[PDB]
Amino acid sequence: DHINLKVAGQDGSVVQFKIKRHTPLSKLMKAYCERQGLSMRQIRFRFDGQPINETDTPAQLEMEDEDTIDVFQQQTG
């Protein structure tokens, strides 16, 4: 089966992320990163306030269906 995660950008973009529960969240981060055409070191993914690691997974973070993910941008200074 597939899980649908709600990733929203600060611009108000909602992406229909069709991913599984065992698929690494790292791939998810890169996907949106490439989608908008930005660098992975430029954006920060937060799940329920907690930052998502490259070793994290939906099944690990106990992410349920229709779970929301916030994407912040790295401060320049």
Binding site: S13, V14, V15, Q16, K18, I19, K27, A31
Partner: peptide, 12 residues
């Protein structure tokens, strides 16, 4: 409403 669709590839 702005919607962007992303499909993920999962390795078996």
């Amino acid at each position: 409403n702005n919607r962007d669709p992303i499909v993920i590839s999962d390795s078996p």
